[PDB]
Design an enzyme around this catalytic site. Structure first.
Site, PDB file in Angstrom:
ATOM      1  N   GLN G   1       0.848  -1.232   0.000  1.00  0.00           N
ATOM      2  CA  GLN G   1       0.000   0.000   0.000  1.00  0.00           C
ATOM      3  C   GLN G   1       0.870   1.263   0.000  1.00  0.00           C
ATOM      4  O   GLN G   1       1.901   1.320   0.671  1.00  0.00           O
ATOM      5  CB  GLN G   1      -0.951  -0.006   1.205  1.00  0.00           C
ATOM      6  N   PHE G   2       0.439   2.271  -0.755  1.00  0.00           N
ATOM      7  CA  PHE G   2       1.193   3.515  -0.905  1.00  0.00           C
ATOM      8  C   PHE G   2       0.965   4.456   0.278  1.00  0.00           C
ATOM      9  O   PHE G   2      -0.174   4.760   0.636  1.00  0.00           O
ATOM     10  CB  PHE G   2       0.816   4.220  -2.213  1.00  0.00           C
TER      11      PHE G   2
ATOM     12  N   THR H   1      -2.707   4.282  -6.209  1.00  0.00           N
ATOM     13  CA  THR H   1      -1.789   3.317  -5.537  1.00  0.00           C
ATOM     14  C   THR H   1      -1.505   2.122  -6.437  1.00  0.00           C
ATOM     15  O   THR H   1      -2.422   1.505  -6.972  1.00  0.00           O
ATOM     16  CB  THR H   1      -2.376   2.804  -4.207  1.00  0.00           C
ATOM     17  N   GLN H   2      -0.224   1.808  -6.601  1.00  0.00           N
ATOM     18  CA  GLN H   2       0.193   0.633  -7.348  1.00  0.00           C
ATOM     19  C   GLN H   2       1.400  -0.001  -6.671  1.00  0.00           C
ATOM     20  O   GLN H   2       1.743   0.326  -5.536  1.00  0.00           O
ATOM     21  CB  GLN H   2       0.563   0.979  -8.800  1.00  0.00           C
ATOM     22  N   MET H 107      -2.824  10.383  -4.707  1.00  0.00           N
ATOM     23  CA  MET H 107      -2.649   8.980  -4.307  1.00  0.00           C
ATOM     24  C   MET H 107      -2.385   8.049  -5.499  1.00  0.00           C
ATOM     25  O   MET H 107      -2.766   6.878  -5.493  1.00  0.00           O
ATOM     26  CB  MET H 107      -3.852   8.498  -3.477  1.00  0.00           C
TER      27      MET H 107
END
Ligand SMILES: [Mg+2]
Ligand SMILES: [Mg+2]
Lengths: 244, 240, 212, 231, 195, 204, 222, 233, 235
Positions: G1-2, H1-2, H107
């Site tokens: 997760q970022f 997000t990746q 994000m």
């Protein structure tokens, strides 16, 4: 650009009249006459179809009298296609009210809603108004039997007896002469047919040129029945009242 | 969406659509407002060109906006319904957020604002309606009477009339209404209001409507017979 | 945090502590927990510092616009409802507030509304909010009367914050006092809890559990 | 005639009358002069009052530390266009850490004005602008017309009676271009230029407005007793 | 909030609602009125999540008051309850639903009959002789099932209500600080100031 | 937590010789707590009957929705809607909420007014039609109902015999379900007469 | 997760004098156990005699300072080159921070300057925009190491006059700019000894009526 | 997000007296699989800037296209596009830094660590870093990923502070960079032997060296290492 | 017809020029700026004696330090006042200070040219905006529907404006007191009004640094009218 071609449908004249509303009323004065009469024990709706043909399928035909719900009906004078747009909206409004409150919509509330829709087309949007006048016949448990009319301006008023369409001036004078407050439905049926018979532009008033309806508490005990008359039933009531 | 500028200036600095909206008001049936020492009375003309009318169900000329404020009008009937509905919604919104009913001045300022907006918005025409707004502020016994017009200007009046032949009844009110001593009772105020309409009306039968508003949400409409008694007493004093 | 407000004969007393913490770390001892909404209205700060600061000075702007438009002082009822309706719009998003909106008008008299970030809006006579609220309630409930003098009411509010400052680890620093009248609020000074504790102990005879 | 009702209509000879009418508003405006050397660029503007009780309408607007303009015509339109220039100068600095080139600023103003000349409903801008600036290629002066036409010049003038100042600058071209490292003398030349456009009135202390930008000089506007030195 | 009760007797509807408001650790108030008058002969009590309760009740109140002014007519208790049910049924599939349960007590002036409607936050409506929300019914329904008669007087209804509150005060862990009791009949709405 | 078993209740429908029957219990609850013993789950629009089990708010909402739609149908078509047509309308309406469905188990019963043919149908919460010749079941005691119907049912039962069969199917199924019972109703439907009977049953 | 946030370390300190104000900060930038830079300026002159630092997540810190500098520029454009007072700047920064209430700038902001009476002023902000005028404020990694020392040596807390034994407090006498800088240097030297994220260099910006001056001092590089 | 899929490892760089040096290997890893062996991760912009990129390769190729578009755009209506109004290292960095911070704020980051190396118009050395979070910083030496842990300590021994820059020649600087690349090849499991190196000098301009190899490696000592403790054979 | 945003051959916007004609029909409003304060005065002009004149609101507060007077189609001013009040309050929220009088005026004037085919037409009202701030002291501005605003030492707008402005040309000097300005506004209003000036058909107001914006009582103005009558009879 596009301004060049705009008729400006929602403007006042120098005299303070709405051009398009006035002209729409002129259109309605050429439509077949519709009459509504209110009695103590019910309401009558009578209306003349416009110059018909022998090849018109009458028993499946409807151009004047429409059911809005089980308690409210309308007589139409003007553009039939315009009327069906508004009629469908009114049917939906009645069902919206019934779903929300679990009670049948009071007659005036339905009339006010349709009249407000007509009003909007005269104040904003730049579109032409609806070329339609309605006679509303209905019953609710607050005011009982009620007659209303509305016209393209979106103005509405209540009546004991009223006419719309062609020859309203002559029709209204005849109704004003013979109408009494203690009148009954069977008497009102006769008055409506006699008035149409005298004001009609046709040579004679026959069953194939008429649409007829009654709203009676002549439904078994404390309830209301709508009766859209069949061609044979209009023929019988014409013989009964001594017009044919 | 339809965006056309219908209300615009002319070379002489006039907005004709707003001025033509006033001509629609001139055509409407006469309405009058008179405030006494402890009441306000609203009188309205009913044109007798329409008989066979059902008076039970026909839209009445005076409308309650809240339990303490009323609104009458002259001009297009259909247009007035839109202003009345908006005013009623705003009255309930005010109670909901401020926890106090509207003052008469606030309600007037709102309705007048709506009217002004329709004079410089694209794709709409002005309301062909002037209004008389009357009532009492919450917990206040001072009578209030305001007037609005299509342009959106508004002001307070000791007594005022709008509609057809309003020039005549204003003439009557200007010489018969004393500011130092306003109609001290309900009787005196109703009498002066019926008198002012009799200058213009025709028959004093079903042609005159009278609504009395007193403090603390006390609003009542007079019946035919009650008004008929005022009509009778006025002319019997006149035969002299 | 400990904040309180109570109604009495002479108006409203507002009293707050001055401490802000991040975990066990004492970030500040000089936090202003009474927000001066305008010269007539006060708000207290509990929960989120920013949420309370931002939205109560915003409230001051809305109150100023109201009196410009209506030519009349806004009611405490109307002022508190503007704030509660605003935070209700944000419900679920994570605002944190617990505040007392305090004012004194002609039509209402002294009025206090507890306003919360879940949307709660309660009118009342005595309110106490924060990590030390229970301690302050004890002193308030056992000494409160409607017929307190301004002098005695001011002391009661000061003493109640001191009680919380002593027992609650996350309350302390100094005590800020306010007295709200019909003609506006009056500031009654900043009182260091360190000095105040010893002064009260000697003069009152309380806190015999503590050696001085 | 029949072809001047809106900006979306060509005349039979290929003219755009609404744009030409917008150009006419500039000619009614008060005179303003622009000129430059190789080190500095100067704006001089004659401000106009309503009467003796009134203030004198401001003519010069700063867009950045290195760029600004003077106006002639509809003042609110200059506010819209100068605001756009402020934003564009700002976008260049924030995103690219780069001072916006004066030539590129002219291109952006041209394109913004053009859109208002080809679409229905809108109207052309009713103002002319003289943009001065100092960037990586030295001093610059631009003239903007609301037709969209932007031109780079050594000197120019716009507004009422601007032809007198323009002829003077055309004579003095070889002299004032050489005024390097002497701000006062370059302003003197600009004040002498704008004087060729005056009639009946003369340059007073609340009448005159001067702006300068250069090598080591941020865009600054002089008004009041700060221009008495040049009267 | 916590306990709300209702009982429909011969000629009136009686609503009882607790006075306590609790912010987690402390009881912030002991005199809270958990009810709103929707119209002269219709009363609504409420309980659920903080903020949403009062916001929903006042929103309904505003709408019914608007209808009353527009039509110059008081809606029947049945009609009001249907309007409220639809609002909650709409709300349950919203982004953030109203977490509010209500009782609607009204006297129908047309039918001359008292009526009690129970509606939960999902929009589940039932007409009942007596009702409750939360855990209130778990303690009180066995007493109401025994003693209730359709021909009870208002005084007998209040006495049966006292027996219900006494059982709540005995077996419930929470201190709800007593109840405010209100009666809805042909003459309108009134509060019993000693209970 | 499971929306289809918060309130409880059951519906069953059966066909006979020139007749159909539909029946339901009367309970509404909040999980363990019994709230109402008068919550009828069968509604009718003209001669077409609709039973609905599941989440009670959705039961009420869908009844109001189908009353709405069948009233507009009648005004436009100038005739009452038939069981076959109404079945398709129920299916269509449920599937339009494919990814946010009404938590219900509807059952249609009726006789076609023109052909005289008996008709029944059932649905899952999202519109799939089960058109059985014999019987349809729905609700928190559907397993129990399947067991009763499968043994008690025989084809071509006369109206008064069908009444006994469907009544015994409902009653005994409900008594093996905690969330069903508290009274019961049975509709016996013929081409132009419908009889409604309330049954006496245990109240626990 | 970022994870959109990070921690760049750093410590900042603002002190308000009688007619001056200082805003100091170390020049070390870090992630985890690595040094990114030994000299990365963290305190900035924002114009109008205002200095600013936004300590914590450096990306958010740079973004906020950049947006405030921009706000000063547009304040001049919109309000006839009026000087932005320190109190007005503070309120403006609150709105910049609260604008991202539900996705905050992960920084602790401090600004310094002079108020409209010429007296020294320091304002302190939390990540979502709550602010206060203060006399003394440390921020960032070693804030907990510095503040107690300042309480004792600037405000003379827990210090009493000899002979009185707790009865008379040590009087709060005003400190000069030379005196304040001594305390700043000793604060950071002590923080450098005990906090791994503090070191390399110390840059101090001093604000008086004459303008903004800079001073730089070496710190231990381990 | 990746998540990053195909990735590039360290980028290293430093300042010297007359300019800057930057280097990066030619590998595109797919987890532990050393999948693509001819990937150029140093991308020149004009003759005064070199952008070195690590992390996700798909995002690198996107950034490469943005820089190509930036050069095209700058030339539009710009007579001085190859002179006074050419792209500066500082312009190119600020643009990238803006993009990186904006993408993290939605994000949806560009999963990279970037070093922009170049020489400005006035001859000044430019060297600055930016990553997926929008974090930026400058230093006499800069390195990404493993380089930060292993290259920086070696490069900081040559230039430890600002005053060491004028004392450092291009020969000494290049030598240090090449040695650091060897050390990374010894110790980073996601590195390759093949790399590219770029020098940007204020006098001699941009020198771009391709197909360089790590050489002078010490492995002989491995023959004497036996077992993990007690084993002798 | 023709566009609402059309230019005339002379380079003027038709609609803006036509709105200026509507303002000429409006009731008179006068402002005078001094070093002791700025005075604002208006002609009420009631259409009938039954109209309660204290409900005529042509002088309005924007903030404590800024007042405003109007002339023309006064209904159009309401949204302009609303915007002005919002702008003043919003700036105080954002910057913890009073907004400059010029900045407030500029914000109001930004609304002016936002019309086309936004609102359908320009405003038909002119405003005199008076106030005080620390940077530029006491100020008076004239805001037009063109979007242009001029600062004035003294200014008159409405039907009696050119006669009043000529009078202001002669009477204004840089040493006027506040009392002298009050009498001067009353004197010039009395000169251009149709009806005879009294406390019920005219209204005064002022803005000072100490007390802020104040609308004068009818009793206070009545005294100043009596003081004016006596000093004119004094020679
Ligand atoms: Mg049981
Ligand atoms: Mg260290």
């Amino acid at each position: 650009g596009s301004r060049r071609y705009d008729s400006r449908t929602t403007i006042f004249s120098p005299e303070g009249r709405l051009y398009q509303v006035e002209y729409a009323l002129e259109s309605i004065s050429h439509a077949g006459t519709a009459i509504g009469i209110m009695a103590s024990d019910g309401i009558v709706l009578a209306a003349e179809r416009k110059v018909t043909s022998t090849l018109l399928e009458q028993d499946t035909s409807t151009e004047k009298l429409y059911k809005l719900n089980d308690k409210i009906a309308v007589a139409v004078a003007g553009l039939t296609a315009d009327a069906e747009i508004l009629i469908n909206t009114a049917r939906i409004h009645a069902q919206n009210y019934l779903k929300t409150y679990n009670e049948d919509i009071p007659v005036e509330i339905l009339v006010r809603r349709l009249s407000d829709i007509k009003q909007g087309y005269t104040q904003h949007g730049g579109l032409r108004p609806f070329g339609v006048s309605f006679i509303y016949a209905g019953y609710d448990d607050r005011y009982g039997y009620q007659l209303y009319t509305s016209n393209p301006s979106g103005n509405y008023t209540g009546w004991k007896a009223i006419s719309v369409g062609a020859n309203t001036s002559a029709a209204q004078t005849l109704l004003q002469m013979d109408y009494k407050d203690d009148m009954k439905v069977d008497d009102a049926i006769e008055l409506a047919l006699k008035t149409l018979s005298k004001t009609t532009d046709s040579s004679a008033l026959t069953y194939d040129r008429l649409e007829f309806a009654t709203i009676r508490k002549g439904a078994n005990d404390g309830e209301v029945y709508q009766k859209i008359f069949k061609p044979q039933e209009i023929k019988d009531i014409l013989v009964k009242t001594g017009i044919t | 969406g339809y965006d056309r500028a219908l209300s615009i200036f002319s070379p002489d600095g006039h907005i004709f659509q707003v001025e033509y909206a006033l001509e629609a008001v001139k055509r409407g049936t006469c309405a009058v407002g008179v405030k006494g020492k402890n009441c306000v009375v609203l009188g309205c003309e009913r044109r007798s060109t329409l008989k066979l009318q059902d008076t039970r169900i026909t839209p009445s000329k005076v409308s309650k906006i809240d339990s303490h404020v009323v609104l009458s009008f002259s001009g297009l009937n259909a247009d007035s319904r839109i202003l009345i509905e908006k005013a009623r919604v705003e009255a309930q919104s005010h109670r909901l957020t401020l926890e106090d009913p509207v003052t008469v001045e606030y309600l007037t300022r709102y309705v007048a604002g709506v009217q002004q907006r329709y004079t410089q918005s694209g794709g709409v025409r002005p309301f062909g309606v002037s209004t008389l707004i009357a009532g009492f502020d919450p917990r206040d016994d001072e009578p209030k009477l305001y007037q609005t017009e299509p342009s959106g200007i508004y002001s307070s009046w000791s007594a005022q009339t709008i509609g057809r032949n309003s020039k005549t009844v204003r003439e009557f009110l200007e010489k018969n209404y004393d500011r130092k001593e306003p109609p001290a009772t309900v009787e005196e105020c109703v009498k002066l209001t019926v008198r002012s309409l009799l200058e213009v009306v025709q028959t004093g039968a079903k042609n005159i409507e009278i609504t009395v508003v007193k403090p603390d949400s006390d609003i009542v409409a007079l019946s035919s017979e009650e008004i008929n008694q005022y009509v009778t007493q006025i002319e019997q004093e006149k035969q002299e | 945090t400990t904040t309180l407000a109570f109604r009495f004969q002479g108006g409203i007393i507002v009293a707050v502590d001055s401490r802000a913490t991040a975990g066990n770390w004492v970030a500040s001892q000089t936090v202003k927990k009474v927000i001066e909404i305008n010269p007539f209205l006060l708000g207290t700060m509990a929960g989120g510092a920013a949420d309370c600061q931002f939205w109560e000075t915003w409230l001051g702007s809305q109150c100023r616009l109201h009196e410009l438009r209506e030519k009349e002082r806004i009611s405490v009822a109307a002022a508190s409802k503007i704030l509660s309706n605003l935070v209700y719009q944000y419900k679920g998003a994570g605002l944190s507030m617990g505040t007392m909106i305090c004012g004194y008008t002609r039509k209402e008299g002294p009025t206090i509304y507890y306003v919360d970030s879940d949307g709660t809006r309660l009118k009342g006579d005595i309110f106490c909010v924060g990590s030390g609220q229970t301690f302050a309630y004890g002193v308030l409930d056992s000494n409160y009367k409607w017929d307190l003098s301004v002098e005695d009411a001011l002391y009661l509010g000061k003493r109640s914050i001191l009680a919380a400052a002593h027992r609650d680890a996350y309350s302390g620093g100094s005590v800020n006092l306010y007295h709200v009248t019909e003609d506006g609020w009056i500031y009654h000074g900043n009182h260091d809890v360190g000095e105040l504790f010893w002064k009260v102990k000697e003069e009152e005879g309380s806190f015999n559990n503590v050696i001085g | 005639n029949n072809y001047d009702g809106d900006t979306v209509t060509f005349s039979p000879t290929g003219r755009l009358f609404q744009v030409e009418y917008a150009l006419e508003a500039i000619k009614q405006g008060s005179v303003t002069v622009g000129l430059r050397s190789n080190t500095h660029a100067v704006l001089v503007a004659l401000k106009r009052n309503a009467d003796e009780l009134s203030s004198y309408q401001k003519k010069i607007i700063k867009c950045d530390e290195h760029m600004g303009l003077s106006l002639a015509g509809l003042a609110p339109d200059a506010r819209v266009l100068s605001n756009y220039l402020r934003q564009q100068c700002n976008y260049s600095s924030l995103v690219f850490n780069r001072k916006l080139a004066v030539e590129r600023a002219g291109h952006l103003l041209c394109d913004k004005a053009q859109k208002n000349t080809q679409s229905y409903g809108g109207r052309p801008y009713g103002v002319g602008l003289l943009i001065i600036g100092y960037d990586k290629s030295g001093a610059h002066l631009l003239e903007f017309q609301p037709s969209g036409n932007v031109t780079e010049l050594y000197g120019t003038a716009i507004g009422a009676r601007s032809q007198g100042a323009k002829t003077y600058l055309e004579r003095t071209l070889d002299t004032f271009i050489k005024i390097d490292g002497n701000p006062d003398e370059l302003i003197k030349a600009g004040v002498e230029a704008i004087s060729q456009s005056l009639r009946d009135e003369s340059l007073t202390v609340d009448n005159l407005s001067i702006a300068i930008v250069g090598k080591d000089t941020p865009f600054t506007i002089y008004d009041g007793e700060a221009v008495a030195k040049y009267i | 909030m916590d306990i709300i009760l209702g009982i429909r007797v011969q000629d009136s509807v009686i609503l009882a609602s607790s006075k306590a408001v609790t912010r987690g650790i402390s009881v912030l108030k002991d005199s809270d009125d958990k009810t709103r008058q929707l119209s002269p002969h219709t009363l609504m009590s409420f309980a659920g999540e903080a903020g949403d309760t009062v916001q929903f009740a006042e929103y309904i109140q505003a709408n019914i008051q608007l209808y009353s002014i527009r039509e110059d007519y008081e809606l029947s208790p049945q009609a009001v309850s249907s309007f409220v049910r639809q609002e909650l049924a709409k709300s349950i599939r919203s982004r953030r639903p109203y977490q509010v349960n209500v009782l609607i007590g009204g006297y129908d002036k047309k039918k001359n009959k008292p009526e009690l409607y129970q509606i939960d936050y999902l929009g589940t409506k039932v007409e009942l002789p007596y009702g409750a929300h939360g855990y209130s019914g778990f303690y009180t329904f066995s007493l109401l099932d025994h003693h209730y008669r359709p021909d009870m007087t208002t005084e007998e209804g209040l006495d049966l209500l006292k027996l219900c509150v006494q059982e709540l005060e005995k077996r419930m862990p929470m201190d709800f600080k007593g109840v405010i009791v209100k009666i809805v009949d042909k003459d309108g709405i009134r509060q019993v100031d000693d209970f | 937590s499971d929306p289809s078993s918060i309130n409880g209740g059951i519906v069953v429908a059966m066909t006979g010789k020139d007749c159909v029957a539909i029946a339901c219990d009367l309970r509404l609850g909040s999980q363990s707590l019994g709230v109402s013993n008068k919550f009828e789950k069968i509604f009718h629009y003209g001669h077409v009957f609709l039973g609905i089990t599941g989440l009670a708010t959705d039961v009420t909402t869908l009844n109001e929705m189908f009353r709405y739609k069948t009233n507009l149908y009648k005004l436009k078509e100038e005739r009452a809607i038939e069981p076959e047509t109404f079945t398709q309308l129920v299916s269509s309406s449920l599937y339009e909420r494919r990814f946010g469905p009404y938590f219900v188990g509807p059952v249609v019963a009726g006789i076609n007014s023109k052909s005289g043919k008996p008709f029944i149908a059932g649905f899952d919460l999202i519109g799939c039609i089960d058109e059985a010749k014999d019987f349809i079941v729905s609700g928190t005691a559907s397993d129990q109902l399947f067991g009763m119907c499968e043994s008690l049912y025989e084809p071509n039962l006369e109206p008064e015999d069908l009444f006994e069969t469907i009544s015994q199917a409902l009653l005994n199924a409900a008594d093996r379900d905690a969330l069903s019972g508290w009274g019961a109703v049975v509709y016996i439907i013929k081409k132009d007469e419908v009889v409604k009977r309330y049954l006496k049953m245990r109240q626990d | 997760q970022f994870n959109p946030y990070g921690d760049n370390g750093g410590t900042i300190l603002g002190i308000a004098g009688e007619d001056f104000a200082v805003l100091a900060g170390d020049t070390r930038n870090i992630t985890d156990y690595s040094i990114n830079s030994r000299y990365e300026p963290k305190v900035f002159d924002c114009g109008d005699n205002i200095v600013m630092s936004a300590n914590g997540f450096a990306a958010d810190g740079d973004a906020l300072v950049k947006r405030f500098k921009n706000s000063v520029k547009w304040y001049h454009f919109d309000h006839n080159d009026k000087k932005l007072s320190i109190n007005s700047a503070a309120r403006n920064i609150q709105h910049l921070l609260y604008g991202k209430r539900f996705f905050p700038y992960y920084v602790h902001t401090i600004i310094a300057g002079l108020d409209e009476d010429g007296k020294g002023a320091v304002y302190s902000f939390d990540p979502v925009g709550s602010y206060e005028r203060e006399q003394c404020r440390a921020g960032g990694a070693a804030a907990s190491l510095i503040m107690p020392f300042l309480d004792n040596q600037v405000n003379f807390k827990n210090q009493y006059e000899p002979g009185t034994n707790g009865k008379v407090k040590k009087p709060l006498k005003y400190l000069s700019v030379e005196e304040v800088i001594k305390l700043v240097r000793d604060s950071f030297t002590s923080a450098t000894e005990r906090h791994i994220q503090v070191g390399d260099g110390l840059e101090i910006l001093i604000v008086t009526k004459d303008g903004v001056r800079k001073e730089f001092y070496e710190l231990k590089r381990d | 997000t990746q998540q990053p899929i195909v990735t590039g490892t360290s980028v290293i760089s430093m300042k010297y007296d007359n300019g800057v040096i930057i280097a990066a290997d030619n590998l595109g890893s797919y987890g532990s699989l050393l999948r693509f062996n001819g990937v150029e991760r140093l991308i020149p912009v004009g003759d005064n800037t070199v952008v070195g990129i690590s992390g996700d390769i798909s995002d690198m190729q996107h950034i490469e296209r943005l820089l190509k578009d930036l050069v095209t755009e700058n030339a539009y209506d710009n007579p001085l596009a190859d002179a006074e109004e050419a792209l500066e290292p500082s312009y190119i960095f600020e643009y990238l830094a803006t993009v990186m911070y904006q993408r993290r704020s939605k994000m949806n980051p560009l999963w990279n660590a970037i070093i922009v190396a170049g020489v400005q118009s006035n001859g000044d050395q430019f060297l600055r870093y930016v990553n997926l979070l929008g974090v930026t910083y400058s230093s006499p030496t800069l390195a990404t990923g493993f380089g930060a842990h292993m290259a920086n300590p070696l490069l900081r021994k040559v230039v430890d502070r600002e005053s060491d820059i004028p004392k450092t020649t291009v020969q000494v600087a290049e030598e240090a960079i090449v040695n650091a690349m060897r050390v990374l090849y010894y110790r980073d499991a996601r590195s390759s032997r093949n790399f590219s190196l770029a020098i940007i000098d204020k006098n001699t301009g941009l020198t771009f060296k391709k197909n360089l190899q790590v050489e002078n490696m010490k492995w002989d000592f491995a023959k004497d290492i036996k077992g993990y403790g007690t084993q002798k054979i | 017809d023709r566009g609402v945003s059309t230019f005339s051959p002379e380079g003027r916007l038709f609609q803006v020029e036509y709105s200026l004609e509507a303002i000429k029909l409006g009731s008179t409003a006068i402002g005078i700026a001094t070093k002791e304060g700025v005075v604002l005065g208006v002609e009420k002009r009631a259409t009938s004696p039954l109209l309660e004149s204290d409900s005529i609101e042509k002088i309005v507060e924007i903030d404590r330090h800024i007042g405003c007077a109007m002339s023309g189609l006064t209904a159009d001013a309401r949204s302009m006042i609303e915007h002005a009040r919002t702008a003043a309050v919003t700036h105080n929220l954002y910057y913890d200070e009073d907004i400059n009088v010029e900045s407030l005026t500029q914000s109001v004037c930004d609304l002016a040219l936002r019309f086309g085919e936004l609102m359908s037409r320009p405003f038909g009202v002119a405003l005199l905006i008076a106030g005080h701030d620390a940077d530029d002291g006491y100020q008076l501005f004239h805001a037009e529907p063109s979007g242009t605003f001029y600062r004035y030492n003294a200014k008159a707008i409405g039907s009696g404006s050119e006669g009043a402005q000529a009078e202001l040309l002669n009477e204004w000097h840089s040493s006027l007191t506040l009392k002298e300005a009050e009498l001067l506004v009353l004197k010039i209003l009395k000169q251009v009004m149709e009806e005879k000036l009294d406390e019920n058909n005219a209204q005064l107001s002022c803005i000072t640094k100490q007390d802020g914006f104040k609308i004068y009582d009818n009793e206070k103005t009545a005294e100043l009218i009596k003081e004016l009558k006596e000093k004119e009879a004094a020679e």
